[PDB]
DNA sequence: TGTGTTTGGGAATCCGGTGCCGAGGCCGCTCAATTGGTCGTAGACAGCTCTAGCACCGCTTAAACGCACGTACGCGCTGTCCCCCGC
DNA sequence: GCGGGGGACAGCGCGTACGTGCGTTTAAGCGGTGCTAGAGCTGTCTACGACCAATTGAGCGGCCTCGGCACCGGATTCCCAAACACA
């Protein structure tokens, strides 16, 4: 049966950050768990926001508000910057 | 056909995140920019942690990252520590820390 | 002959274990304890090995954090020896029952 | 075989090692039993939930994923064992 | 006439644990909340029930914090609560790094 | 403006907590902690308001901001 | 025409709970017995709390229940206290409790 | 005039069953409404998780029972399960 | 130097009157629950494979245990000085 | 703002309990073998729940009443703080 992971994406990001460092299988398991956990946190918070504004779609705005709620100060600032950058680039092209 | 991740300049799978949002019953409908924004945020957090863990591994003359290095990276960065505060990491250990009272005079 | 003063080896052991990552409880007795506890909820229960491993990881993490808070409480009381009352206070403040 | 009085398998040196990892320099003699109590309680709380999650799935075997899910249900999430 | 020291402290402990009303003046707290919120977004308006909810939550939080602080002070074999007790209680609770 | 939380108010809050004797340095600590708490609640509440296109912080926003930290509050329309 | 609550011998609204389950995005499909079971559980829990709170109110020579009585009922019952441990009750107060150390000799 | 939803009347009926000569203030009714909504959301969320965990698409009485066992303390969970199973038994026995 | 008991005296509590406002009941209305019926499919059941959990055995050695021995830390006691408490 | 008294903090002694070390015992750990219960996957078919149109009564808004509770004053009682008699 097929299995789902973020292994290859995490490895690509690491190569983008530290181009000469490898990573264990156990550490890839932990990074996969962390990515999942954060994903569920953000998506659950966005769903909550949407249903408690009597609103039916999850838009980028819901994700941004969820990011401000979940992430600490400087991390939330930079994450919001990256998200806005990505949405702008995606819609421009 | 070029993938959504490429068009947004990301490395995380925008289409896959969109699929999980749809098949996760968070809402009946999902906007177009929501998966892009979420993938960008996830990629940024992963990049930050991998930065810090690689630095910690190089601090130990190690070229591979192990859960101990991830624990040191998380527990040494205060905003990451706040984010992953209630999280325990298998084979992680603890920070080297001895109270100044216990040290001999 | 030669004998170290009380507390020197304690610090040495503190540095060695705070530096290492290996599990500090023997695996077989912990597995037996887990099985005998679960025997009280359903008879004839099998366990994946990784399930017992996860349980041991979680228990050791919990106990290490608890011992950190106990040591803080003990130092707060101008003591160096941790005492059961320190454990009780730490769990009371933490919110456990 | 029946399993009985395995709480004594958590020996005094193992408890001392755990306390050392916690930065503790001196340990009282009554600590060891108290610890074996605390641990036994923690385990009962975790196992009861894991077993519940296994009963609901109709399985006779407790998987590691049930333990992870019980842990995160207690707000004590664990990384490194899937999920 | 005078009462013996600490006696009135106990009387007020009983008096305030018997009752349920808010122990913070409503208008200073309202001014403080508005002042704090000015740093996040400017020119906000608050329903009265919003400020009531904030006041209730803050008072409950502070009472719980003082309970933990009292536990810490008793543990050190004192009767007077000191800032070190607050810091230890908050650190164990997981609020203070 | 944090000074609106007077010495007797903190004394009363401690009394409800069962505290018999209070040191003189408690107050500036208590003010600090309380202020931090309020900032952590109000931030989230305001975030909910700004997300809702509104300009008025409602008691419901505060209730969700409290439930955010696991400080569930009963009695305000939750 | 007899209501679903009546047919199950309950007083809580089975139909309303079913509607909330459907319109709450908990799952795509909802079984027939799920709202009945859930309504029974809520009714039982409410009955427990109203028992304990009525007793507490009668302990104060009061024939009406006020938030103080509900707070005392919850904090005095250990399984309810475990259930509602992280919950604060508006206008609730606290349990009368003084440490035995603080009392004079 | 909007539409408001609450459990005031049902809570009042349960109260009349339990303590017939006893009333409830409006503040206490608001608290009980909050409690009922809170518990409903806890149980429903745990049941939704259980339904998803098993790769399952429907919320049945089994999921509600398991969620009740998970959330409530032991004795309370036991009585709650007894009451719920009795209610579903009566509901399906009649028709 | 010490302490069992005294006793006027503030402080919390009880009791009766009273008044007032919200809780409980009643009515008119409406919209959401109920009935009956169609239809699609989720899952319950059977049945089949293969893995991974359990039980056992033997051997080595590292860890646990018991014990001797010493010292250093906890705890009790005394003193003082000052900083919270009561008003 | 002020008087003062109790508690926090400093210093000392002592005694036993905890740390260090040594030798013996035990069972953990590792490997290796074998068995089978049960987890995981697949095909069917069927009952069960979603959807929809029509019916209607249960519940919600709005009004109205009175009794339960808040409040006030007056009397009851209950802890209190040293002072005294007496050891």
Numbering used by the authors:
A (entry chain h): 29 to 121
B (entry chain g), G (entry chain c): 14 to 118
C (entry chain a): 38 to 134
D (entry chain b): 20 to 102
E (entry chain e): 39 to 135
F (entry chain f): 25 to 102
H (entry chain d): 28 to 122
Q: Anything the authors wrote about it?
A:
In chromatin, linker histone H1 binds to nucleosomes, forming chromatosomes, and changes the transcription status. Here we report the cryo-electron microscopy (cryo-EM) structures of transcribing RNAPII-chromatosome complexes (forms I and II), in which RNAPII is paused at the entry linker DNA region of the chromatosome due to H1 binding. The nucleosome is composed of linker DNAs and the nucleosome core particle (NCP), which folds an approximately 150 base-pair DNA segment into a histone octamer, comprising the four core histones H2A, H2B, H3, and H4. H1 binding to the nucleosome induces structural changes in chromatin, thus regulating transcription processes catalyzed by RNA polymerase II (RNAPII).
The form I complex is the predominant configuration of the RNAPII-chromatosome complex. In this complex, the globular domain of H1 binds to the DNA at the nucleosomal dyad (on-dyad binding). The structure of the chromatosome complexed with RNAPII is similar to that of the RNAPII-free chromatosome. The H1 binding restricts the orientation and flexibility of the linker DNAs. Surprisingly, we found that the exit linker DNA fixed by H1 collides with the clamp (the Rpb1 clamp core domain) of the RNAPII transcribing the entry linker DNA. The H1 globular domain does not directly interact with RNAPII. The specific interaction of RNAPII with the exit linker DNA would hinder the RNAPII progression on the entry linker DNA. In the form I complex, the H1 bound to the nucleosome restricts the linker DNA orientation, and the exit linker DNA is captured by the RNAPII DNA binding cleft. As shown in the form I complex, the exit linker DNA directly interacts with the RNAPII DNA-binding cleft, thus inducing the RNAPII pausing. Interestingly, when the Spt4/5-bound RNAPII structure was superimposed on the current RNAPII-chromatosome complex, Spt4/5 overlapped with the exit linker DNA in the form I complex.
